[PDB]
Paper text:
The HLAI residues that are polymorphic are mainly those forming the peptide-binding groove, which contains six binding pockets (A to F) that define the size and chemical characteristics of the specific peptide repertoire that can be accommodated by each HLAI molecule. We show that single polymorphisms between different alleles of the [name]-B7 superfamily can induce a conformational switch in peptide conformation that is associated with differential HLAI-specific escape mutation and immune control.
[name]*81:01, together with [name]*57 and [name]*58:01, is one of the group of HLAI molecules most strongly associated with immune control of [name]-1 and the viral replicative capacity in [name]*81:01+ subjects has been reported to be lower than in subjects expressing any other allele.
Residue numbers in the entry:
A (entry chain C): 1 to 9
B (entry chain B): 0 to 99
C (entry chain A): 0 to 277
């Protein structure tokens, strides 16, 4: 089950 | 630096037996960047029905892929894997040896 | 022993002049791949790559598909930003890779979590094992680090890694179980290949094993040998299992002084093998 996108680098 | 050349192994799924259907594998690993071309060859000729695995990578971030096809080996047919990558000036051909 | 992992491996590759950067994601439980997504598919969607995950309902596939599409967009922003941090030309191709996931013990409890990145194949920034702080490779990655800290990202990752990562990994192991909790020991043998009148190769084979981790070692007179040995990378058979060999060049007539030693989780005790001229 993947995590969501987060924040860009 | 930021380019790594593929390692290539060519081998069967099962121990080869002349006349018995099997799978021919060409495993390409240790490479970067990810774009790569690979053909499986029967007596020099490209084999059409070839499949490959989904792109993944190792702990050192280098990529790996398995290319494979059904085949039935014989005493006389030669098989090989031909690979091109940005690190190679020309395609590298590695011949299948049933003992490796 | 008895431990398990879940991992997702993301690859974004830019291709100026040939569209937007490709995004690919694969998911694994241990050495078993179970899902994929590829932005270059005609209709990009998360797809099953093992039988046991097919049972999940439409809400699972839909959620995850929407995740990957968002991640693809986020990675495209990251690629732009990284090109800027490195003063790089808009004309070249660059790669952003991402790996995350959790390791659990036999009791299902978190042993450790992971969330790290590479740029053009070099480590860029990583979530530390505390799940609270970051390690940056260079001054570009320090920029990303400040941004991640500002957005509280480690906190979110910690909650995922302690929570859903472990919980879903447990669900897979429990219904997925026949394949995921089953170690298959290697089938082993030694072959003999004359090289000359003076020398022969002994090749020690391990076939049909899972998971991939194995150790194969040749001793001479009970002493570990690396001189005049060759050890191939462990390789996939294509049927979920793996293969590997190690070889040693020996003086002909001295074959019986050589032993091959095999260690694998599927083995109750390590094996030692000699060539048996049948």
């Amino acid at each position: 089950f993947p995590r969501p996108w987060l924040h860009g680098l | 630096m930021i380019q790594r050349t593929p390692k290539i192994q060519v081998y069967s799924r099962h121990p080869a037996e002349n006349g018995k259907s099997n799978f021919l594998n060409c495993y390409v690993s240790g490479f970067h960047p990810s774009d790569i071309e690979v053909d499986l060859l029967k007596n020099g000729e490209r084999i059409e029905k070839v499949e490959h695995s989904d792109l993944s990578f190792s702990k050192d971030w280098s990529f790996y892929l398995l290319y494979y096809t059904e085949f039935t080996p014989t005493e006389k047919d030669e098989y090989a894997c031909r690979v091109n990558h940005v690190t190679l000036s020309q395609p590298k051909i590695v011949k299948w040896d049933r003992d490796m | 022993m008895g431990s398990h992992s879940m991992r997702y491996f993301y690859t974004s590759v830019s291709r100026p002049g040939r569209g937007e950067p490709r995004f690919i994601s694969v998911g694994y439980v241990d050495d078993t791949q179970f899902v994929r997504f590829d932005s270059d598919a005609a209709s990009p969607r998360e797809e099953p790559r093992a039988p046991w995950i097919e049972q999940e309902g439409p809400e699972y596939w839909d959620r995850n598909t929407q995740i990957y599409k968002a991640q693809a967009q986020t990675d495209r922003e990251s690629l732009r930003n990284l090109r800027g941090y490195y003063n790089q030309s808009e004309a070249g191709s660059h790669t952003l890779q991402s790996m995350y996931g959790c390791d659990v013990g036999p009791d299902g409890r978190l042993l450790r979590g992971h969330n790290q990145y590479a740029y053009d194949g070099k480590d860029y920034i990583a979530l530390n094992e505390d799940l609270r702080s970051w390690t940056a490779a260079d001054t570009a990655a320090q920029i990303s680090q400040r941004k991640l800290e500002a957005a509280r990202v480690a906190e979110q990752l910690r909650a995922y890694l302690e929570g859903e990562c472990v919980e879903w990994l447990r669900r897979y192991l429990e219904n997925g179980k026949d394949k995921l909790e089953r170690a298959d020991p290697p089938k082993t043998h030694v072959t003999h290949h004359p090289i000359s009148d003076h020398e022969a190769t002994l090749r020690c084979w391990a076939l049909g094993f899972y998971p991939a981790e194995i150790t194969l070692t040749w001793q001479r007179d009970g002493e570990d040998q690396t001189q005049d040995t060759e050890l191939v990378e462990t390789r996939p058979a294509g049927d979920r299992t793996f293969q590997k060999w190690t070889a040693v060049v020996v003086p002909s007539g001295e074959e019986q002084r050589y032993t091959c030693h095999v260690q694998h989780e599927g083995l109750p005790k390590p094996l030692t093998l000699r060539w048996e001229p049948s």
